Amino acid sequence: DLLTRYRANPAMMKNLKLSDIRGALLKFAKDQVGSRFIQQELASSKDRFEKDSIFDEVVSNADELVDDIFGNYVVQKFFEYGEERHWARLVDAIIDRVPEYAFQMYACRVLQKALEKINEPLQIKILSQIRHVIHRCMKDQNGNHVVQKAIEKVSPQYVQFIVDTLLESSNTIYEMSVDPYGCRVVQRCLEHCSPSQTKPVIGQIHKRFDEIANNQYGNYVVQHVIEHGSEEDRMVIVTRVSNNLFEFATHKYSSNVIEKCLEQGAVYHKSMIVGAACHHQEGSVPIVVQMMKDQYANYVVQKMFDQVTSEQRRELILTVRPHIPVLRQFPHGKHILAKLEKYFQ
RNA sequence: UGUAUAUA
Ligand SMILES: [Cl-]
Numbered sequence: 568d569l570l571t572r573y574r575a576n577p578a579m580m581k582n583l584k585l586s587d588i589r590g591a592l593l594k595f596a597k598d599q600v601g602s603r604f605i606q607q608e609l610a611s612s613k614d615r616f617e618k619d620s621i622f623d624e625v626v627s628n629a630d631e632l633v634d635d636i637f638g639n640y641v642v643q644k645f646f647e648y649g650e651e652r653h654w655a656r657l658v659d660a661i662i663d664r665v666p667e668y669a670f671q672m673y674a675c676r677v678l679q680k681a682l683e684k685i686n687e688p689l690q691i692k693i694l695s696q697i698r699h700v701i702h703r704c705m706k707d708q709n710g711n712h713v714v715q716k717a718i719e720k721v722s723p724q725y726v727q728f729i730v731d732t733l734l735e736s737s738n739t740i741y742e743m744s745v746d747p748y749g750c751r752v753v754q755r756c757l758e759h760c761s762p763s764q765t766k767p768v769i770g771q772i773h774k775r776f777d778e779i780a781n782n783q784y785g786n787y788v789v790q791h792v793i794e795h796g797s798e799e800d801r802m803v804i805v806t807r808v809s810n811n812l813f814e815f816a817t818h819k820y821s822s823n824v825i826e827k828c829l830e831q832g833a834v835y836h837k838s839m840i841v842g843a844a845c846h847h848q849e850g851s852v853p854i855v856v857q858m859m860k861d862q863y864a865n866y867v868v869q870k871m872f873d874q875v876t877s878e879q880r881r882e883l884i885l886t887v888r889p890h891i892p893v894l895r896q897f898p899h900g901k902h903i904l905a906k907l908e909k910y911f912q
Numbered sequence: 913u914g915u916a917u918a919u920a
Contacts, residue, residue, distance in 0.1 A: 599920065636920065676919060708918060715917095751917060784916060820915060863914055899913045 592624035
């Protein structure tokens with residue numbers, strides 16, 4: 568009845584405080600208008616006891632509020648930085664159903680707010696439950712964000728079980744790299760995990776490099792290997808793409824990998840790619856010229872002109888200068904050479 | 913002329 572009154576004439580009730588909600592916290596937190604009063608009060612109130620008064624109502628009904636369209640924000644407000652005195656109780660209120668909450672679209676946002684704010688003992692206490700559903704959680708539309716959040720906010724030694732799940736079986740990393748949600752977990756792992764953890768992960772990627780490099784999601788995983796992997800990792804990749812420059816460049820997704828190699832690679836990595844592009848075939852035309860005729864590889868050669876040194880750019884100009892006549896007669900070849908005209912003068 | 917990344 569208290570909520571029914573407050574919805575009708577809200578401005579006629581501008582004195583309402585959180586201590587007045589009392590046993591109405593459930594109806595308020597699950598209401599569109601009610602949950603905001605709670606949130607606005609929690610943010611604007613300077614009284615620690617008013618905010619603590621409803622907290623036992625929050626703990627008592629946490630299991631019902633975490634995956635509510637509106638209640639999930641009320642629970643999140645008590646995970647904020649100025650509420651550390653309440654973290655341990657709130658985690659215990661939800662700890663046993665974390666395996667469920669990881670897959671729910673509202674409750675997962677609460678688990679992320681927890682991992683973002685709480686201290687390491689409680690973080691490990693939440694990953695304790697994610698351990699039970701980790702493989703299925705990595706691929707979930709909701710759960711992958713909880714695994715991503717753990718990788719960013721928890722020290723590498725306490726997310727080792729996530730890495731060992733990537734190395735669960737021989738095909739796990741391929742399975743994850745080609746999954747629209749598991750591939751995001753692999754990238755976060757490449758960004759934040761220790762070299763002893765990322766070296767076996769990058770090891771599995773190399774064995775099925777071609778498939779992953781041309782997958783609509785795995786190509787992002789390969790691009791993250793180039794940037795965050797070792798210098799030898801970039802060598803094995805650049806040597807791989809250099810010897811198969813035409814195949815990698817003329818496919819929709821692996822063409823982005825060659826672009827990533829040019830933006831990240833050192834001078835001699837650029838030299839391997841430029842050398843392979845200008846390597847004259849005895850019975851045909853240089854690879855860079857065929858690449859300019861392709862729907863995808865033409866963006867790769869302009870990337871070369873934008874990224875290589877002047878002497879390597881010099882090598883490219885002496886290679887395709889005899890070929891502009893036959894190049895202009897291919898689809899979009901006029902716009903391609905026009906973007907390249909600043910290099911042909 | 914060519915690719916992704918969840919809440920009122
Ligand atoms: Cl859902």
